[PDB]
Structure formats: structure tokens, C-alpha cells
Design a binder for these strands. Structure first.
Ligand SMILES: [Mn+2]
Ligand SMILES: [Mn+2]
Length: 392
DNA sequence: ACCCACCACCGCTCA
DNA sequence: GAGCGGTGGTTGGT
């Protein structure tokens, strides 16, 4: 649920997460804040195979990707007030990356939408579009390839939907969920959408006046709100159930006090725990000894580089040089510079103090495409010299 | 009596 | 959660 909603509101704009990140950083002069429904992982990460704990290993890699994007994420967990990777390990790993874990009192997607409304986050990444019913304005879904590397997302805009052909707004979709559900039998997304379009989605708190209006409209269709008449659809008395109505209208979410607490404490003083990550990966992935250390260095270095650029907003302690420029399609033509750096020097781990058991040398220069905007923010002098040398 | 377009629903598969 | 074909039902007819 809601089944068939995408044929009504649209499938959504497919867009590079990098583009969303960099555009917001340019438009709003600070990194994008994104609430992530923790329920999204449940079917995406238990598809990885091989090695030790591949499910949380997938989680590790998408966290490194979040670093590379410069996104400030907050992962929201479900609460018990709702009407196989460990939560403990997920939260432990979230802290090691300098990210934020947040426990909803009830359903996470309701909390995520609430956080967005309160200006705690700029957008929501969830299983589906249910977030719109809980007040979300910008909601993201399907963080995946476009495949290979997971670079793109599917963006739904609540205002544009309420204007587009469906005319489905928040209270329209509630009525759809009220009548269709998954409650009137024989109904019915098509009819529910037509009922919503007629404006029956208010529901501004003796409600039986309203109920026998559309009930009259469903069987006679004198206003012509429908393609046909529906004398077969017969409506229960409990309906419209009002517990259900305000499960959407005021879902159980964090207290005002919690909101203002988050408002001062998120984003946190984000810092990646290197030594913490080294122990985690050794314990959980069997990334043991010198090979395991080098493996962590290689994977973590680029994101750690991006992350430290923004955090200052000669310092060649980050970028050793620049050599190219591109507007690749994977980022929807977001200007990137080919950047060099020393992985082990940047991560700050010495593979030597670990036992030894073509290849990759963490002490030699590695290359990475980093968004030009982030580089100008973090290493402005090196970028100007690159621009200077290239007008010759 | 029968056709017909539309639709709601079920079972299916992959996440 | 979300895509597919079947299909049984409803509607408005033919
Ligand atoms: Mn949920
Ligand atoms: Mn949902």
C-alpha cells in the first residue's frame, strides 16, 4: 500500500544523489540533511553474499558512499508505539561513522516526515510514498544503480503532486488510504481518487452528514464525480474509522522537547572514528592483520577526504594535486575534479603495526573524482592553481 | 442473453 | 514494496 499510487501521482523524478547533495550545498550554503527510514535496508542488504556478515558489510559501503556525498544523515529506527542484521550493530556502526541514530516513538516514516516538517532534515529517504501522508514534502525512494554503483534516487515532490493531474494532496491520499486501504470493499483506488478529487478529503472533524453525501454521490453520481455509479459498493458503519483518520492526521511522533533537542544537536560534531572502524571491521568482516588494514584504508580514504573538506567550512594534507575535470552522467553532469591523495596518510593508519600474512600501496598516490564545489570549499588554493595552470 | 471496458483483487516474482 | 497476468465483478450497454 498504496497499491497503484504511482500510476496516479507519477513514478517520480530519477535523479543523482550527488546532484541533490551538491545543488543543496550551493543553494543553501550547508550540507544536505537527510532522514533515512531504517526499514529500507531490510530487503536490499540481505542480497549480498560471501565473506563475514555481508548484510552489514553492504551497510558499511553505503555509509562510505554517504561520506563521499557529504550528506549529514540521520537514521530513524521504529518505536514500539506502532498501531537479519542487528539493530545494536547498525547503531554502533552509525556512531563510528560520525552519523546520527534516532529512535522514533512509533513508525519511523511518520517520524521522518515530522523531522522534515520541523526543518530538522531537508528530505526523507523511505520505502515508499506513505511519508507524504505524514506530512513529507520532498521524499526519496529506491536508492540504487542506474546496473552497478548505487548513484541515483527517485524523488517525489508533494506540492507538484497536488498540482499535477492526480490532485492528490496529503488529505487526498489519506482518503484514498481510508477508502481503498488494503475500509470499503470493492474500493478501489480509481474511485477513491475520484472521491478525493471531488474534495471529500476534508475531514475537518456528527460526521455522518459528509458520509451520506458521497454515499449519495456514489450511487446516483448526479455531480458526476465518477465514471459510473456504484450501488454495489456498500459502506460499513465503523467507516469512516476515526482512529485511522488521525493515525495519519496526528501520528505518534517525538515530543516538542525532543524536536528542539535535535534542533541543537543535529548535525553532530561529525568525526569518523578510524581506530573504532578498524576494530569493527576486524571483528565483523574478518578484515584481519595488514591486509585487513589496507582494505579499510582503500575503501575509507575517498569519503574521509570529502568529509574533511566540508569540515573546514599548507593544507595539501588533503589533496596532493588535480589533473582533470568532468561532467559525468552518473552525477547528472555535476562538475568534478580528478584529485590525488595518499590514502594511508589521509586515513592515519599504519599497516606496519599489523602482522604481515600489481597490488595496492596505501602510501602511493590514489585518484578520486570529487565534486568541484566541495573542493572549492575545502581546498580553494589548490583549485585556483589548477584553474590557473589550465588557462595557459 | 451476451458482450464490453474498466477495475479490484489475488498470486506471482524480486527486492 | 512494487511490478506483472489472470480473473471474477461491476457497469453500461448491445
Ligand atoms: Mn515503516
Ligand atoms: Mn509504507
Amino acid at each position: 500500500g498504496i497499491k497503484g499510487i504511482y500510476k496516479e501521482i507519477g513514478s517520480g523524478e530519477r535523479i543523482s544523489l550527488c546532484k541533490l547533495a551538491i545543488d543543496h550545498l550551493e543553494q543553501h550554503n550547508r550540507p544536505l540533511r537527510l532522514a533515512i527510514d531504517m526499514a529500507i535496508w531490510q530487503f536490499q542488504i540481505q542480497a549480498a553474499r560471501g565473506g563475514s556478515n555481508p548484510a552489514i558489510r553492504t551497510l558499511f559501503y553505503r555509509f562510505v558512499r554517504l561520506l563521499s556525498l557529504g550528506i549529514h544523515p540521520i537514521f530513524v529506527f521504529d518505536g514500539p508505539n506502532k498501531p537479519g542484521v542487528s539493530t545494536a550493530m547498525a547503531k554502533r556502526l552509525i556512531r563510528l561513522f560520525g552519523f546520527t541514530a534516532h529512535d522514533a516513538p512509533g513508525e519511523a516514516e511518520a517520524e521522518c516526515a515530522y523531522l522534515e516538517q520541523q526543518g530538522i532534515v531537508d528530505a526523507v529517504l523511505s520505502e515508499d510514498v506513505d511519508t507524504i501522508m505524514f506530512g513529507s514534502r520532498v521524499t526519496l525512494r529506491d536508492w540504487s544503480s542506474e546496473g552497478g554503483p548505487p548513484t541515483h534516487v527517485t524523488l517525489h515532490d508533494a506540492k507538484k503532486i497536488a498540482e499535477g493531474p492526480s490532485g492528490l494532496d496529503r488529505e487526498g491520499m489519506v482518503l484514498v488510504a481510508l477508502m481503498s486501504g488494503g475500509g470499503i470493499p470493492g474500493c478501489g483506488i480509481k474511485v477513491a481518487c475520484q472521491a478525493a478529487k471531488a474534495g471529500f478529503g476534508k475531514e475537518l472533524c456528527a460526521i455522518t452528514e459528509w458520509k451520506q453525501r458521497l454515499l449519495h454521490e456514489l450511487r446516483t453520481n448526479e455531480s458526476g464525480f465518477f465514471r459510473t455509479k456504484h450501488k454495489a459498493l456498500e459502506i460499513p458503519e465503523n467507516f469512516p474509522n476515526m482512529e485511522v483518520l488521525r493515525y495519519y492526521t496526528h501520528p505518534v511522533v517525538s515530543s516538542p522537547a525532543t524536536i528542539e533537542r535535535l534542533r541543537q544537536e543535529f548535525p553532530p560534531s561529525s568525526t569518523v572514528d578510524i581506530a573504532g572502524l578498524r576494530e569493527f571491521t576486524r571483528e565483523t568482516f574478518d578484515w584481519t592483520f595488514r591486509p585487513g588494514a589496507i582494505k579499510l584504508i582503500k575503501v575509507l580514504a575517498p569519503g574521509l577526504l570529502v568529509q574533511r573538506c566540508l569540515d573546514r567550512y599548507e593544507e595539501s594534507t588533503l589533496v596532493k594535486g588535480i589533473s582533470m575535470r568532468r561532467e559525468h552522467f552518473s552525477t547528472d553532469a555535476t562538475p568534478e575534479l580528478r584529485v590525488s591523495f595518499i590514502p594511508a596518510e589521509l586515513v592515519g593508519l599504519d599497516p606496519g603495526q599489523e602482522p604481515e600474512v600489481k597490488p595496492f600501496d596505501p602510501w602511493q598516490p590514489d585518484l578520486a573524482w570529487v565534486p568541484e564545489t566541495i573542493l572549492k570549499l575545502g581546498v580553494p588554493v589548490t583549485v585556483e592553481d589548477w584553474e590557473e595552470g589550465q588557462r595557459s
